[PDB]
């Protein structure tokens, strides 16, 4: 949930070539593969039902479905630490819920806010500054860092430049295998 709902959101802009096919998808395939879906009861739904609303960041919709009746369902209490496993967990949520603006909500963002972004997610400002810092050196977002002002203009305009290269995603498979047909033949 913390190495899937983050990792493959950077190549899931119709940019598939990092595919990990042993994950929640063992569940995610089958418990959206039905029609009548209301309040979750089991572990897998009561995990997936706020996973999908951790996807569309919703920073408290993602958290406060992991701390209702799980505590007696042997998630929170069952570990011989009461509020320290959740203090580990919900911190690990509050950090992977600024790293949602990173890959997800950056579309038509030309100006960006930073004081209020950590105040919104009620986290230590530096603790959510250092992973957005990580995202520049690791994820290399089409955005520009100027952190003496504590703002970043993005200039992210690949909006429909990315779709004729969605037609190149395959002209890659064209180009990959014409670098493989003679390997076949000769």
């Amino acid at each position: 949930y913390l190495v899937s709902a983050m990792l493959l959101e950077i190549p899931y802009m119709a940019a598939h070539e990092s595919d990990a096919r042993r994950r929640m998808i063992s569940k995610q395939f089958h418990h959206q593969l039905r029609v009548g879906e209301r309040q979750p009861l089991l572990g897998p739904p009561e995990s997936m039902r706020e996973h999908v609303v951790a996807a569309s960041k919703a920073m408290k919709m993602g958290d406060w479905k992991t701390c209702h009746s799980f505590i007696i369902n042997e998630k929170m209490n069952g570990k011989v630490w009461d509020l320290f496993p959740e203090a580990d967990k919900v911190r690990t949520m509050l950090v992977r819920k600024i790293q949602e603006e990173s890959l997800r909500t950056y579309l038509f963002t030309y100006s960006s806010v930073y004081d209020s972004i950590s105040m919104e997610t009620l986290s230590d400002m530096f603790e959510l500054d250092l992973p957005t810092v990580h995202s520049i050196i690791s994820k290399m977002i089409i955005n520009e860092e100027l952190m003496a002002s504590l703002d970043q203009p993005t200039q992210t305009v690949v909006m429909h430049r990315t779709e004729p290269t969605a037609q190149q995603n395959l002209a890659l498979q064209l180009a990959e295998k014409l670098g493989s047909l003679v390997e076949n033949n000769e």
Partner: protein, 324 residues
């Protein structure tokens, strides 16, 4: 002038045929490949003058199941009562694609042309092709394929037929060129919606003003192309990677197994020499998937030559017009 290979002529679809087509245009089957009828023409000077064609009603709620031949047998009875006999000189669709030759319908087109060699199969294109180049495609199937019949078979009759190497696309005939005088009264309808009841002629020039402005016209087409060229192209190459996983990569190791044993024993068999060289599943070619692979990738490129020029002529127009 308009002869193909020995038996066939071009087609001549006067506009009064075209209107019984576009009544069942892309509706009673929108995202459903309705075979929109059989081209009931006749054999006149250089041309298969189509006169009246009847739309065939596949059981269209969400799919297409083949309906009664009693329909076709009464539509032919019906046309015989006032019009020509059932001189079916082709069959026609549209139907929800810009310039595509459907393989299973190309087999329905093949056996149709083996039966009546004087046949061109129409692919109508309304504005769904984005307007767009070549709207009426009376695509007949190669007579060199109609020679090596039946049909295009997978492993045998592929190397044999692709040493004969029958063409993949052939004779997309010129259709409606001349004042046939069926015409008459739809001309006499122009001079009235040229005249004072002219509210309907402009509204056809309206289908011009809410086509462009708003419709993804490039993008959503290029996205559907962005889906078509990733699956079809990689699969043909997965074919053209699996075939020489077997053509050479196997026969590299098949002869390696054979040559190692000194190519048999003098006093006995030659047991494993008879056992070795067991032919792989594609030994040759796989020219059945591939021929229509040729057609449908070459068809990707007509859509592409469509997405070519349709484009250009906006980039011309809005760089032209804008600039004043």
């Amino acid at each position: 002038g308009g002869s193909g290979d020995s038996a066939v002529k071009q087609v001549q679809i006067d506009g009064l045929v075209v209107l019984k087509i576009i009544k069942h245009y892309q509706e009673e089957g929108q995202g459903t490949e309705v075979v929109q009828g059989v081209l009931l023409g006749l054999v006149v000077e250089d041309r298969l003058e189509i006169t009246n064609c009847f739309p065939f009603p596949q059981h269209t709620e969400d799919d297409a199941d083949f309906d009664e031949v009693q329909y076709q047998m009464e539509m032919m009875r019906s046309l015989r009562h006032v019009n020509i006999d059932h001189l079916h000189v082709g069959w026609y669709q549209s139907t929800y694609y810009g310039s595509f030759v459907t393989r299973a319908l190309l087999d329905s087109q093949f056996s149709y042309q083996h039966a009546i060699e004087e046949s061109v199969v129409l692919i109508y294109d309304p504005i769904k092709t984005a307007q767009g180049s070549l709207s009426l495609k009376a695509y007949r199937l190669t007579p060199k394929l109609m020679e090596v019949c039946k049909e295009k078979d997978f492993s045998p009759e592929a190397l044999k037929k692709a040493n004969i190497t029958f063409e993949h696309m052939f004779e997309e005939v010129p259709i409606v060129i001349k004042n046939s005088h069926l015409i008459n009264v739809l001309m006499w309808e122009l001079e009235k919606k040229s005249a004072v009841a002219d509210k309907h002629e402009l509204l056809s020039l309206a289908s011009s003003n809410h086509l462009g402005k708003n419709l993804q016209l490039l993008m959503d087409r290029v996205d559907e192309m962005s889906q078509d060229i990733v699956k079809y192209n990689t699969y043909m190459r997965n074919t053209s990677k699996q075939q020489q996983q077997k053509h050479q990569y196997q026969q590299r190791r098949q002869q390696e197994n054979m040559q190692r044993q000194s190519r048999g024993e003098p006093p006995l068999p030659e047991e494993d020499l008879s056992k070795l060289f067991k032919p792989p599943q594609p030994p040759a070619r796989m020219d059945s998937l591939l021929i229509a692979g040729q057609i449908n990738t070459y068809c990707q490129n007509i859509k592409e030559f469509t997405a070519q020029n349709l484009g250009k002529l906006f980039m011309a127009q809005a760089l032209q017009e804008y600039n004043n």
